[PDB]
Amino acid sequence: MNTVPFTSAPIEVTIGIDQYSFNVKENQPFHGIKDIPIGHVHVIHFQHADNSSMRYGYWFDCRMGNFYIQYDPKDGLYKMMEERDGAKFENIVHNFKERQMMVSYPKIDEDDTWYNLTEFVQMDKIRKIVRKDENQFSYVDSSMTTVQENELSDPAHSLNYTVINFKSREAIRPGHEMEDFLDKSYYLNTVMLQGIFKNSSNYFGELQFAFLNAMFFGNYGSSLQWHAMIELICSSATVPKHMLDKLDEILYYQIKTLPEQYSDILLNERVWNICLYSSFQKNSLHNTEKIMENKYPELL
Amino acid sequence: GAMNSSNYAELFNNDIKLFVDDTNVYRVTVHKTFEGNVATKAINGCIFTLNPKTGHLFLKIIHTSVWAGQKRLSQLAKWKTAEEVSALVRSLPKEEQPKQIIVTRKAMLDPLEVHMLDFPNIAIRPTELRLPFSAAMSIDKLSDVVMKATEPQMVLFNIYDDWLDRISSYTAFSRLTLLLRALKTNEESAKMILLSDPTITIKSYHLWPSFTDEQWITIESQMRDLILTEYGRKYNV
Ligand SMILES: O=C(O)c1cc(-c2ccccc2)no1
Numbered sequence: 001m002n003t004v005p006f007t008s009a010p011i012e013v014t015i016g017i018d019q020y021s022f023n024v025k026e027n028q029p030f031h032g033i034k035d036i037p038i039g040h041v042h043v044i045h046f047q048h049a050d051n052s053s054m055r056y057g058y059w060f061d062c063r064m065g066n067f068y069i070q071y072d073p074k075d076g077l078y079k080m081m082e083e084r085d086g087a088k089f090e091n092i093v094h095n096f097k098e099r100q101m102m103v104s105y106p107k108i109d110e111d112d113t114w115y116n117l118t119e120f121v122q123m124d125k126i127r128k129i130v131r132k133d134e135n136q137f138s139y140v141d142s143s144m145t146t147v148q149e150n151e152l153s154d155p156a157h158s159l160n161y162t163v164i165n166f167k168s169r170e171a172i173r174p175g176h177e178m179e180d181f182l183d184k185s186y187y188l189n190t191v192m193l194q195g196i197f198k199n200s201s202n203y204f205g206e207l208q209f210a211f212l213n214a215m216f217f218g219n220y221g222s223s224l225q226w227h228a229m230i231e232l233i234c235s236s237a238t239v240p241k242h243m244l245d246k247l248d249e250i251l252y253y254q255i256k257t258l259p260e261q262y263s264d265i266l267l268n269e270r271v272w273n274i275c276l277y278s279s280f281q282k283n284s285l286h287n288t289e290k291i292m293e294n295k296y297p298e299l300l
Numbered sequence: 301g302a303m304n305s306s307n308y309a310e311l312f313n314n315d316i317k318l319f320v321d322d323t324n325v326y327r328v329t330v331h332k333t334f335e336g337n338v339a340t341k342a343i344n345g346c347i348f349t350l351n352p353k354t355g356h357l358f359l360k361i362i363h364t365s366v367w368a369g370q371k372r373l374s375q376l377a378k379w380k381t382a383e384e385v386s387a388l389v390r391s392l393p394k395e396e397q398p399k400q401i402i403v404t405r406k407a408m409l410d411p412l413e414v415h416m417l418d419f420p421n422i423a424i425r426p427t428e429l430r431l432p433f434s435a436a437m438s439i440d441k442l443s444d445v446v447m448k449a450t451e452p453q454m455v456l457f458n459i460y461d462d463w464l465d466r467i468s469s470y471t472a473f474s475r476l477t478l479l480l481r482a483l484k485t486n487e488e489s490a491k492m493i494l495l496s497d498p499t500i501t502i503k504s505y506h507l508w509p510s511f512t513d514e515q516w517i518t519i520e521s522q523m524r525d526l527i528l529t530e531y532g533r534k535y536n537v
Contacts, residue, residue, distance in 0.1 A: 001369050140346045167410070178379040 002062030003093050003102065004044060005032035006078075011051035013078065016057065018042055018114050019257060020106055023049075031101035032069065034093075036062055041121050043140075044069070045216050046078050051182050055217045057142035061123040064136045064242055066085040068092075080137050087199060116253040120205035129160050129209065146221035158212070159221060162196055162206060164228040166235075183280070185238040192232065203229065205252060211254050214266060227271045234275035234282075244284045247262065251288040254264055255295065263296050273300055302307045303402050304428035311352045312469045315465075317356075317400040320346040320385055321433035322408055325362050326377035342367050348433050349380050349388065353461030360384050361438075361446050382411035388454075389419065402427050432480035437464045438487050439506055443488045461506040466513065475520065479508070484522040485530045493522045 012026040017033050024030045026049075045057025058080040062065055064071060065082045066089045072079050083089045096102055107114075123136075128139040146159045165171060171187045172180045180186050197203040207229040213222035233247055235240055258266055276282060276289050277300075293300065311317065325347055328340040345362040351358045366380065369371055389397050400423045401416075401465070403409060412424050437443045445455050467475075480488040500509045511519060531537065 167413055167417070172414055172417060174418075177383070178376070178411070181410070181414050 001035045001105075003034045003036065004037060004060075004062075005089075005093050005096055005102070006030060007068065010071045010073070014047045014049065016043070016045040016047075022103060026151060028287070029101055030103075031096040031099075032093075032103075033105060034097060034255070035103040035105045035107075037107060037114075038062060040118050041092055041126065041254060043212065043216060044080070054141055054143065056139065057216060058137045058139055059126050059130070064123060067137060069223075076185035080135075081135060089270075095238060101189070112259060113253065116249070117257060119250070120201050121208050121212075122205060125202065125205050129206070129289075131156070131158075131160060139219055140219065142202060142217045142219055144219060144221070146225065149221045149224075150220070159219070159225075161225045162192070164225070164232055166232075168201060173224065183237045184232055185236040188232050188236040188252050189238065191215060200240070200246070204246065208250065208254075215262070218265070223266060223268075230275060231271050231279075231298070234279040234285075237280045239281065239284075243283060248285045248287045251285065252291055253261045254292050255288060263299065267296065269300055271300050276300070302426045302428055305448070306431075307309065307436055307504050311469065311473065314353075315400065316351070316396065316398045317353070317402060317406060318351060318398045319348075319350045319402050319427075319431070319433070320381065320384075320408065320412070321350075321431070321436075322378060322381040323402040323405070324348065324371055324432040324437055324466040325381050326367070342373075344446050344449050345377075346436070346442070349385060349434050349435070350459060355458045355464065355469075355472065357453045357459045358388055359442060359457060360388070361449045363449055366452070378408055379415075381416040385412060386415040388421070389416070396508050398422060400425055404429075404431050405416045432477060432484045433478040433493060435484040435487075438480075438483040438491070439507055441502075457507065457525055459507060461503075461508050474515070474527060478520060478523050482526050488525050490523065492527065493519060 009024045009028055009030040010026070012024065014021055014023050015033075017036070021177070033044070041059060043057050043059050045055060047055050054077075056077060058067075060080065064085075066086065067082055068089070069078050069080055123138075123242055126138050127133070127136075128147070130140060132138065138178050140159070144157060144159055145153075145159050147155075148161065148163045148165070150158055151163075166184070166187075168179070170191060171184070173186060193200060197206070207226060210222045210226040210229065211220045214226055230247075230251070233243070248289060272292065276285065276292060325345045326345045327345045328338055329343065330338060331537070333339050343366045344364055347358075347360040347362065349360070350356070351357040360378075367376075370376055385401065389401075397419075399421070401412060402411060402425050404427060406426045409424060409426060416422055418423060432500075437446065442457070459476060460469075462474070463472045479490070479494075480492070494509060500511060500515065502509050
């Protein structure tokens with residue numbers, strides 16, 4: 001188990017760690033998060049008490065370095081940094097742990113929720129969507145736009161998700177206009193899976209990362225990408241059986257974790273009704289359909 | 301975006317544009333079978349592609365063989381229309397290609413957009429005008445060429461005959477829409493209004509009779525009366 005210590009907490013803030021969250025008071029003796037499970041990526045995220053504008057946060061993997069958080073009073077935010085002095089790091093953490101100044105990552109033993117949400121998400125792929133090569137961790141916030149959003153404006157601060165556009169020359173072979181528009185299998189299997197992602201695991205990783213950024217930061221372009229990657233599969237007549245079964249599991253745990261009160265803004269009625277009730281794959285997502293109908297029947 | 305009565309004069313400016321109406325592409329008769337079921341029989345159709353400024357009509361005749369062994373024909377017809385309009389645009393010299401294509405039915409937007417991806421600067425637009433272009437097959441010479449076709453064929457017409465020698469394209473389009481609306485509402489009565497006087501004839505190279513300016517005023521008034529008469533019969537007014 002690994003640790004993300006905090007130098008201090010000078011401003012009141014709600015702190016998230018993966019799907020958990022807690023409140024820290026202004027100048028409270030908080031010095032970080034311990035017992036973080038090794039083997040998964042993680043995200044540590046923030047919403048200031050005095051200004052809920054800009055949710056922001058950091059994706060990281062404790063296997064890739066020793067990371068800590070320190071508040072910057074000039075830029076007005078909690079910043080992740082890497083400590084290269086290993087013995088300094090351990091010495092600081094030990095003082096903080098001995099004085100019980102850290103919260104414990106509160107994982108129930110029965111609970112696979114975080115694994116189920118991040119099964120295909122790897123740090124190396126995150127760092128290609130979020131480009132800041134000098135850091136081993138990745139900053140994301142609520143207002144960051146996507147490359148596709150910027151084509152329709154600072155490129156250094158953008159989310160480089162794979163562009164999906166159903167009415168584009170990439171999606172439609174000349175001479176196969178009706179076929180390719182009504183059955184997106186070409187676009188899914190040849191263009192996206194064989195060509196760009198190389199395999200379904202990378203595709204699902206980006207889909208899962210998009211969802212998590214929509215949920216944890218309210219990032220709109222991430223929500224658009226999540227829905228586009230679902231619709232591309234559901235609108236394809238020919239999808240490998242293992243992908244359909246895995247997608248049903250992926251979406252089930254996403255819909256299970258979504259805050260009930262954020263559904264009006266995180267779920268696109270058109271896409272979900274099309275995917276569950278009209279698409280080629282309308283009968284292939286049994287678990288997702290059942291949780292959607294029992295949890296959000298109004299959307300449908 | 302959409303095209304309506306606020307921006308109506310835009311149809312007659314100097315930016316090349318085409319209306320596309322797909323109503324008559326897939327045409328069927330419905331009949332009983334020997335076993336008492338119901339079956340369709342397709343008949344020849346046409347795409348109505350019109351330049352409202354010049355009167356040039358590109359009538360692509362859709363022969364029933366294009367439907368042979370195909371499924372979901374009402375859906376296919378929209379994509380066949382878009383395929384043929386795209387092929388027409390590609391066949392025209394650059395300086396004759398339209399800057400806008402206006403579809404009379406919104407279901408044509410996505411098929412035409414997809415077939416025209418290679419032409420990102422041609423705008424594909426709907427319209428809020430309810431245009432009576434379905435009644436094109438009530439123009440005898442258009443119906444005759446479509447029904448006699450034994451293979452796919454494109455035929456070119458000027459749907460304004462020689463009117464633009466004497467009137468503007470705004471007035472010519474208004475006359476055409478009034479005539480087509482009347483033919484749509486009561487075809488026999490409209491055909492009788494158009495052909496009752498035997499001394500006024502249709503030139504070999506025209507679609508409509510050779511009315512003088514004053515006679516066109518009379519005909520237009522008779523057509524408006526027909527439409528109002530039919531509205532009164534319909535709604536009991
Ligand atoms: O030129 C023709 O073919 C024509 C004219 C008429 C006609 C008949 C009744 C009343 C008015 C016109 N029928 O055929």
